[PDB]
Amino acid sequence: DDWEIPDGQITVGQRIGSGSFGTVYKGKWHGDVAVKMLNVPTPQQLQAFKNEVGVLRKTRHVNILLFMGYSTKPQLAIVTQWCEGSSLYHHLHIIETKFEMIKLIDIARQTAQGMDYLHAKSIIHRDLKSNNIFLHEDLTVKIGDFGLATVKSRWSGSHQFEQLSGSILWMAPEVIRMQDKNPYSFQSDVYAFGIVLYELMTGQLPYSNINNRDQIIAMVGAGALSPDLSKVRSNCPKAMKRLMAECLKKKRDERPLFPQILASIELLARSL
């Protein structure tokens, strides 16, 4: 495979963080890059990993984090562009950046634009959340962390337990239960997007009044817990508040898909 970066070319730099799936470093390879290093594979796992890289190779869009190559030594790794800036999670919940409503709407629009692109390519993200949406140069949304779905979800020792803890807030009721036919769908991505909209339009994570992540898992999975939409800022447009409730519908068939979502956001942006 021609997308393997030969060993010895990448220089690792700053450790950005160690998540439930891999550690990300800033790096140098023809300039700044990000390097996500996975676990410390059999021939079958190497072939499966290359198959997953095939999915990443399908994505070429300015709202999608740019895949640049992969490595197998010292460990399996994914190399992408380096985003100059912070994630949406960092802005909203850590440093509490005060975006104007017009810019919050634009961030929502750009996120929907990337999701629409993925879905058009038959890619279900499965892991959308504000800490893998990066605000590049404070201007351009880049969505990442949709790669290696089979590696993340199916391989032994991929820290699935930790992944659950880190993703529960964005996870649709049917993804929690995994009982319905095809629990991961375009519609479950829409629900996660609905939670990102909640974060943008309230400045808060959902369920901040519920201390217990187990109660959240059980309650959302039972269809008995939804974000408190009364916390949306006073200047959030009513059409945007309605859209957010549509994306968050507990019954997945009631959720709009991203062509409709994009048209709604674009209409209200161009209505100001």
Ligand SMILES: Cc1c(Nc2c(F)ccc(NS(=O)(=O)CCCF)c2Cl)ccc2ncn(C)c(=O)c12
């Ligand atoms: C955390 C992070 C990443 N993470 C990251 C990565 F390193 C490698 C792959 C994926 N995702 S992927 O699905 O495997 C590929 C998707 C495209 F194909 C992601 Cl999300 C990337 C760039 C970053 N730039 C700036 N900053 C501040 C960051 O924190 C940052």
